[PDB]
Amino acid sequence: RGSFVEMVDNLRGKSGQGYYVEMTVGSPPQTLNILVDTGSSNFAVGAAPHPFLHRYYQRQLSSTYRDLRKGVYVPYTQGKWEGELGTDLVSIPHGPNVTVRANIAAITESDKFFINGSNWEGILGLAYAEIARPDDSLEPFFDSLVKQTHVPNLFSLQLCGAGFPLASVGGSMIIGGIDHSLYTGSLWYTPIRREWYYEVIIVRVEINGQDLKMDCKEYNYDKSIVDSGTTNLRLPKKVFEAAVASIKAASSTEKFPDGFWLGEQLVCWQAGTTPWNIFPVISLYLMGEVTNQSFRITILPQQYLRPVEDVATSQDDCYKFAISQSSTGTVMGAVIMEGFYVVFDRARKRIGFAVSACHVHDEFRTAAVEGPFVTLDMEDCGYN
Ligand SMILES: C[C@]1([C@@H]2C[C@H]2C(=O)Nc2cccc3cc(Cl)cnc23)N=C(N)OCC1(F)F
Ligand code: NA
Ligand code: NA
């Protein structure tokens, strides 16, 4: 409890390509890098020689593979994959010293799924069985882990973002506990509303302390989730409209093209001259543990302005605006998570946030987690 030195710094990534952990599958163990995804519930790995892949799961080499004689076709909004289901022995080398028999979807065909130039070959869906494909009878990895070992039913994530000049991203996934070296101040917990996605309820939104004053149901239409497998902070369309109006206003001392705010074009500045100060902070108040009690998390432009390094057309420091409109509810992606140490306390059906010891900031502002606040009618903020 509280100290897991073997798991610190077990995440790696490249800016724009997500955060992955080393895993092994099969006997003898085959090493793969696997994207950590709290927004899905399947363990799915490349199993055929797709040209984008560094390596792939070769079931024929594993003496412990067991075929489930069942396939799955998984379409996303953009892109898809098709796989064959089976079980095999799975371990996390820089994780708990255990090996479990887990479901594995061996990906045999995919479209717009793997990233050309990335260093990961599969995804680890850490959410609940309700959203597993093809149905909720396919036990997710973490459920198998907890069922088969003495690993406590919780994990925590510290995602450490980037800044010019481009160095790799990194962080820590603490499996079965919390490492108190990874955050400062106190953890504040918000309830997991329902165990499918890691669904939470946002009760108030501010831009530089200025309340959007929308009906709070709007903030969670049709859900709000914590998702390490999405870059952006995605906001419901109506909320995005209000938020971006407020952000434009706060930053009006400089004018940027309309397309910038829509993520249709980059903005660039001469190296080292990014005007962080003109951009507002963004605060989400989350439902607390106690009736009529909330707490607030606050992120900086350092989180929501993403550095884009691979721009052969330009010579400067270029950025993408990574708050975007949603039709799937609020998505608290890497833009939120990079500010915080996030504790997925499954045992107690709650998510903890604390200020990350690694988050990107400046001399004037830092990410924050603050409470308690008094917030009435928070139950009305959930969409039904
Ligand atoms: C299944 C799925 C795939 C696995 C997600 C994915 O590929 N994510 C990413 C792709 C590219 C750059 C990224 C950067 C960061 Cl920081 C995170 N994820 C990144 N999971 C979620 N949660 O939402 C999208 C999805 F398709 F449903
Ligand atoms: Na157990
Ligand atoms: Na601490």
Sheet with most strands: 6 strands, mixed, barrel
The backbone outline, from C-alpha atoms, is globular
CATH architecture of the largest domain: Beta Barrel
SS class: mainly beta
Strand content: 35-45%
Q: What count of domains describes the coordinates?
A: 2
Number of DSSP strand runs: 26
CATH class of the largest domain: Mainly Beta
Please give the radius of gyration in angstroms. 21 Å
Query: What hetero molecules are bound to the protein chains?
Result: the ligand C[C@]1([C@@H]2C[C@H]2C(=O)Nc2cccc3cc(Cl)cnc23)N=C(N)OCC1(F)F, sodium ion
Note the gap between the termini: 37 Å
User: How is the CATH topology of the largest domain named?
Assistant: Cathepsin D, subunit A, domain 1
Helix % is: under 10%
- With helices defined by DSSP (H or I, 4 residues minimum), what is the helix count? 5
Q: Taking strands numbered 1, 2, ... along the chain, how are they ordered across the largest sheet?
A: 2-3-8-4-7-6
Within CATH, the superfamily of the largest domain carries the name Acid Proteases
PDB class: hydrolase
Keywords: protease inhibitor, hydrolase-hydrolase inhibitor complex, hydrolase
Assembly: monomeric
Entry title: CRYSTAL STRUCTURE OF BACE-1 IN COMPLEX WITH (1SR,2SR)-2-((R)-2-amino-5,5-difluoro-4-methyl-5,6-dihydro-4H-1,3-oxazin-4-yl)-N-(3-chloroquinolin-8-yl)cyclopropanecarboxamide
